[PDB]
Amino acid sequence: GFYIRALFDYDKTKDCGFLSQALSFRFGDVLHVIDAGDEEWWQARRVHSDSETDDIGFIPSKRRVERREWSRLKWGSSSGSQGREDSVLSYETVTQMEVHYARPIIILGPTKDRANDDLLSEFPDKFGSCVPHTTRPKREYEIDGRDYHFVSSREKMEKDIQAHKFIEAGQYNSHLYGTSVQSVREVAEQGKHCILDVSANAVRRLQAAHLHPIAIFIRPRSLENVLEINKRITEEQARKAFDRATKLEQEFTECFSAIVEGDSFEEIYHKVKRVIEDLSGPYIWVPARERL
């Protein structure tokens, strides 16, 4: 057969009370498909972190998932311009491969900064940050190659950016800053997980660089849940956080390695550590070339 990764949560029994041989699964689960000859239902079994064998069941095909989703909502204030392109996430084919580097880490969503700081502080021999580049002139107290890799020519960095040498870059106070593929690779090859403070946009570039990251989205269940996990912010900025999170999930779900939820930061932190443990390797699942 072959392997696919679920990009949505599925549980028919919980949803409508219908009992059947349909398998239930959650976002991120790797599924071993044994027979996908039928266009509507495929035979499969969930791949555990130990025992792949457990219960052969059936999962809805990509076709079936798409048909169901399109069947939902949609003149409603039509300006006459095209709307956002219809995109239905179902599954992604994947394959197992062995890696000899520590996977970089990208935590996203509310409290990601605290999670980053705590991992860096709690496990200094396992996690570290990479050295960023900047065109800003080096200050008296700064050290080239430690605080930043100071680039004398802004022209060169702009060229390097266009050449996609940075997984992420930007401008601040009229100067350029960026996290280079090479800086991340240096940390990764030394066997340390590189804690990255970048957007989900960086996942594709890291994948292209053969530095598959563990991208973890901390998903708030509601506005109130945000206040439960981050009780150091005003309810006003909590609204923003929740909306920013909703928009992040809408646009980058396919890039996430996992999604974690909790009633407290302590629960989230615990789950983050477990996800990293589960996906660190040596054997990991990456996108395959097979197409459904």
Domain boundaries, the chain: 1-74+90-99+282-292, 100-130+192-281, 131-191
Q: In Å, what is the CA distance from 174 to each residue of 134, 170, 177? A: 11, 10, 10
- Between CA 252 and CA 108 the distance in angstroms is 10
Topology of the domain covering 100-130+192-281: Rossmann fold (3.40.50)
Give the β-pairing of 127-128 and 193-196.
parallel
* Token pair for 123: 């496990």
The answer to whether the CB of 39 falls within 8 A of the CB of 12 is no
Least Cα distance to 178 among 197, 204, 155, 193 occurs for: 197
Name the method of structure determination.
X-ray
Beta bridge partners of 98: 283
Give how far the C-alpha of residue 12 lies from the chain's centroid of Cα atoms, to the nearest Å: 26
Beta bridge partners of 116: none
Give the β-pairing of 166-172 and 283-287.
unpaired
- Between CA 272 and CA 275 the distance in angstroms is 5
185 phi/psi in degrees, rounded to 5? -60, -35
Residue 237: count other Cβ atoms within 10 Å of its Cβ: 13
SS (H, E, C) the chain: CEEEEECCCECHHHHHCCCCCECCECCCCEEEEEECCCCCEEEEEECCCCCCCCCCEEEECHHHHHHHHHCCCCCCCCCCCCCCCCCCCCEEEEEEEECCCCCCEEEECCCHHHHHHHHHHHCCCCEECCCCEECCCCCCCCCECCCEEECCCHHHHHHHHHCCCEEEEEEECCEEEEEEHHHHHHHHHCCCEEEECCCCCHHHHHHHCCCCCEEEEECCCCHHHHHHHCCCCCHHHHHHHHHHHHHHHHHHHHHCCEEECCCCHHHHHHHHHHHHHHHCCCEEEEECCCCC
CATH class of 131-191: alpha beta
1-74+90-99+282-292 — its CATH code?
2.30.30.40
The answer to whether the CB of 220 falls within 8 A of the CB of 111 is no
* Token pair for 256: 């996430």
- Between CA 245 and CA 151 the distance in angstroms is 34
Residue 236: count other Cβ atoms within 10 Å of its Cβ: 8
The answer to whether the CB of 153 falls within 8 A of the CB of 137 is no
Q: How far apart are the first and last CA of the chain?
A: 13
For 228, half-sphere exposure in the C-beta direction (CA atoms, 13 angstrom radius) is: 15
Least Cα distance to 191 among 99, 286, 283, 285 occurs for: 99
